[PDB]
């Protein structure tokens, strides 16, 4: 059977490894990067590449647990293998935004529970492993988390990752190499 996270090539995901977050479509954006938006002195904003031919930034996927893999439904922290030189760390986390809850990097050392707020979900496109991206702090087994990360294109064209009730991300995981 299959019940651990699986990459774009059919191999179990290495817990803590770098896998690119790529799209399930073509001419609609590239991999996932950063962007300096508003008044951040550096790209603290996580957005989708405006370059259809890019794999984006190589992201780290950790369960912050002692497993070689990452079980389905488990929470994970996603973070830049080579993050902006101005963040307390490379891990992503959510903060309130007038565009709704935005995914960003922080100039603050964050307590675990602020970064391990992500979870993947099986899109039923069968033959390749496509996942949606959930944001859950308040977690588990009494209530289902249903806060999907969508995209928000601001006036300056940035495809910002926030929590939207529409056009939610659907991704595939490509293992980064040397």
UniProtKB/Swiss-Prot annotation:
UniProt keyword annotations, A-Z: Disulfide bond, Protease inhibitor, Serine protease inhibitor, Signal
Disulfide bonds: 42-86, 136-145
Pfam families, sorted: Kunitz_legume
Single GO MF annotation: serine-type endopeptidase inhibitor activity
Membership in a protein family: Belongs to the protease inhibitor I3 (leguminous Kunitz-type inhibitor) family.
Task of the protein: Inhibits alpha-chymotrypsin at the molar ratio of 1:2 in state of 1:1.
Protein name: Chymotrypsin inhibitor 3
Lineage: Eukaryota, Viridiplantae, Streptophyta, Embryophyta, Tracheophyta
């Amino acid at each position: 059977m299959d019940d651990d996270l699986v990459d774009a090539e059919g191999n179990l995901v290495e817990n803590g490894g770098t896998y690119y977050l790529l799209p399930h479509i073509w001419a609609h954006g590239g991999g996932i990067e950063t962007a300096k938006t508003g008044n951040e002195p550096c790209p603290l904003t996580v957005v989708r590449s405006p370059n259809e031919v890019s794999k984006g930034e190589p992201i780290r996927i950790s369960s912050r647990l002692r497993s070689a893999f990452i079980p389905r439904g488990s929470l994970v922290a996603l973070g830049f293998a080579n993050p902006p030189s101005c963040a307390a760390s490379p891990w992503w986390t959510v903060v309130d935004s007038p565009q709704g809850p935005a995914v960003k990097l922080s100039q603050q050392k964050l307590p675990e529970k602020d970064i391990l707020v992500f979870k993947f979900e099986k899109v039923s496109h069968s033959n390749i492993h496509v996942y949606k991206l959930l944001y859950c702090q308040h977690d588990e087994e009494d209530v289902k988390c249903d806060q999907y990360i969508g995209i928000h294109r601001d006036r300056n064209g940035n495809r910002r990752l926030v929590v939207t009730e529409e056009n939610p991300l659907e991704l595939v995981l490509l293992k980064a190499k040397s």
